[PDB]
Design an enzyme around this catalytic site. Structure first.
Site, PDB file in Angstrom:
ATOM      1  CG  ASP A   7      -1.747   0.902   1.289  1.00  0.00           C
ATOM      2  OD1 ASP A   7      -1.931   1.645   0.602  1.00  0.00           O
ATOM      3  OD2 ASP A   7      -2.310   1.621   2.330  1.00  0.00           O
ATOM      4  CE  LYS A  68      -1.909   7.666  -3.405  1.00  0.00           C
ATOM      5  NZ  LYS A  68      -1.894   6.319  -2.803  1.00  0.00           N
ATOM      6  CD  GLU A 172      -5.009   3.751  -2.354  1.00  0.00           C
ATOM      7  OE1 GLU A 172      -5.822   4.583  -2.740  1.00  0.00           O
ATOM      8  OE2 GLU A 172      -3.775   4.067  -3.711  1.00  0.00           O
ATOM      9  CG  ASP A 194      -9.197   4.888   1.852  1.00  0.00           C
ATOM     10  OD1 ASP A 194      -8.571   5.215   3.031  1.00  0.00           O
ATOM     11  OD2 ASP A 194      -8.548   3.982   0.923  1.00  0.00           O
TER      12      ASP A 194
END
Ligand SMILES: N#Cc1cn([C@@H]2O[C@H](CO)[C@@H](O)[C@H]2O)c2ncnc(N)c12
Length: 377
Positions: A7, A68, A172, A194
């Site tokens: 992850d 990211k 994800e 999330d």
């Protein structure tokens, strides 16, 4: 060879192995299951993870994080213009693309985002190799469901630089569904909520006879646990000024010590109702000592909690779904352990209870490791 699951998060990464029939989420060298996605370039040394994150207070221009947010994007993209205004390290335009600029022994040094992500992947690789006692050349790595081909390819290039063949990229939401073992037979519509340290993502995931499809995605790229902490920080900085005539923002070290204790108090308030925040000598001759209640924690953040519902209405509208069409709600991210977040989701879904695990910060890495095992057979 072995295939590990990673992850690669905005604020942290997490690595898992599938071995003798189980997923093991591996501790880094400091005994944590989560590694901050930080790399520091200070005084001729490079650090990755928690030691890098600690450099951010005194060396903010040399401490790289949230890469990211930049990976596979263009310098002039509206999201990247906004991130350059928020991030303290220099971002430059290399041929239309954002690159990170720092100093190594005073020399200007430019990195593509995938070169910084590769340093995070290489630390996760090393944790795996040391645990398995053999070299690791293959990985499943997660990305957000909204990642386009350039964002997925730059993630694969980060893996290549780190000496990892990324045999599969999975989203994800899919990884969360594998972690929770959601039944793959027949048709199921899942809302994946999330809420991490820095970002909020919601997806509608449909599972249909073992085929996973994300039908709709929405979110808020600047809403997570760190925003909840900053609201508490703002409150206590105001209070300490009122009582002591000291503005803690004037001392960067005092701020760093308070942020650590505030993060711990937030976590405690997911279980208890009242917690003490204490720092001896937060500045010389002055102790910090306060009580925070769950009610004041909620009052300080209630507008941000309710903002999470705006992307939820958007993904339901985009997929032309009624609330009742959702068969289950799955929570991922540490911040979903906040009791008020679960209560607001339950109420929005006219009483339907959301599914959580006990380790929502590890679910995505867990599912990446499951996908690794599924690929090995
Ligand atoms: N353990 C734990 C928890 C983790 N997080 C948060 O998840 C984010 C990502 O790690 C970060 O912003 C962190 O602070 C929690 N938030 C509230 N209650 C908790 N009990 C936790």
């Amino acid at each position: 060879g072995p295939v590990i699951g990673i992850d690669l998060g905005t604020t942290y990464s997490c690595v898992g192995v599938f071995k003798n029939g189980r997923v093991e989420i591996l501790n880094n060298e400091l005994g944590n299951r989560i590694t901050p996605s930080y790399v520091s370039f200070v005084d001729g040394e490079r650090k990755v993870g928690e030691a890098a994150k600690l450099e951010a207070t005194l060396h903010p221009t040399q401490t790289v994080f949230d890469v990211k947010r930049l990976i596979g994007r263009k310098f002039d993209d509206q999201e990247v213009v906004k991130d350059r205004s928020l991030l303290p390290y220099e971002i430059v335009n290399n041929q239309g693309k954002p690159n990170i600029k720092v100093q190594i022994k005073d020399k200007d040094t430019t990195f593509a985002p995938e070169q910084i992500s590769a340093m995070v992947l290489e630390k996760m690789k090393e944790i795996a190799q040391s645990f398995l006692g053999k070299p690791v050349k293959n990985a499943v790595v997660t990305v957000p469901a909204y990642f386009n081909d350039a964002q997925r390819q730059a993630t694969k290039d980060a893996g290549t630089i780190a000496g990892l063949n990324i045999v599969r990229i999975i989203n994800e939401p899919t990884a969360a569904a594998l972690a929770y073992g959601l039944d793959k037979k027949e048709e199921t519509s899942i809302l994946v909520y999330d809420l991490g340290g820095g970002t909020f993502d919601v997806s509608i995931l449909v599972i249909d006879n073992g085929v996973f499809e994300v039908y709709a995605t929405a979110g808020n790229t600047h809403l997570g646990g760190e925003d909840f902490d900053q609201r508490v920080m703002d409150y206590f900085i105001k209070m300490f000024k009122k009582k002591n005539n000291i503005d803690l923002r004037t001392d960067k070290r005092a701020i760093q010590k308070l942020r650590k204790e505030v993060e711990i108090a937030k976590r405690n308030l997911s279980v208890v109702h009242s917690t003490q925040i204490e720092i001896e000598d937060i500045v010389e001759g002055h102790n910090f000592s306060e009580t925070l209640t769950r009610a004041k924690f909620e009052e300080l953040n209630d507008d941000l909690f309710r903002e999470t519902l705006e992307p939820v209405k958007k993904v339901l509208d985009d997929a032309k779904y009624e609330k009742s069409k959702i068969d289950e709600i799955v929570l991922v991210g540490g911040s979903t352990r906040i009791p008020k977040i679960q209560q607001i989701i339950k109420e929005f879904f006219n009483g339907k209870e959301p599914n959580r695990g006990i380790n929502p910060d590890e679910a995505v890495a867990y599912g990446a490791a499951i996908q690794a095992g599924i690929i090995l057979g």
